[PDB]
Design a protein around this ligand. Structure first.
Ligand SMILES: *C[C@@H](O)CO[C@@H]1O[C@H](CO)[C@@H](O[C@@H]2O[C@H](CO)[C@@H](O)[C@H](O)[C@@H]2O)[C@H](O)[C@H]1NC(C)=O
Length: 130
């Protein structure tokens, strides 16, 4: 499914993402827009990683979810990648929380560094009442 902008902001807030590890909701919204366009079905091949990125937060099958076809994968989220392709984002959020718990943190997403970091991110949550 493709989330409406404020629909996602409220869902992410309800699931505890606002301020999770210091990362504000606006920042999460920004990475989600740039990564998948708020689309839970988005999957993109990672060219230099022999893996695939899955879902709304574009999580990498080499380190976080097992898709059954990635060479030398780890599966730190202990999730099957298809779980990150469902309309219900509860598993995707738990996994994204898992990702930011590593040293690199939010820097694990190049889209956040190129489009959100050192940028105004207010626009993503403007008018959502979150
Ligand atoms: C979404 C895809 O295009 C890129 O995904 C990111 O890929 C990098 C590696 O290129 C992942 O970083 C790794 O994270 C490991 C655990 O923290 C670490 O051991 C390894 O050295 C490297 O830093 C990154 O997690 C991944 N991001 C996502 C959201 O999947």
């Amino acid at each position: 499914k493709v989330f409406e902008r404020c629909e996602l902001a409220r869902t992410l807030k309800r699931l505890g993402m606002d301020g999770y590890r210091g990362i504000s909701l606006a920042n999460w919204m920004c990475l989600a827009k740039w990564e998948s366009g708020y689309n839970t079905r988005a999957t993109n091949y990672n060219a230099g990683d022999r893996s695939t990125d899955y879902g709304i937060f574009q999580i990498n099958s080499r380190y976080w979810c097992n898709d059954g076809k990635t060479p030398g994968a780890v599966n730190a989220c202990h999730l099957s990648c298809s779980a990150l392709l469902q309309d219900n984002i509860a598993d995707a959020v738990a996994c994204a929380k898992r990702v930011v718990r590593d040293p690199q943190g939010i820097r694990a997403w190049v889209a956040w560094r190129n489009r959100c970091q050192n940028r105004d991110v207010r626009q993503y949550v403007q008018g959502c009442g979150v």
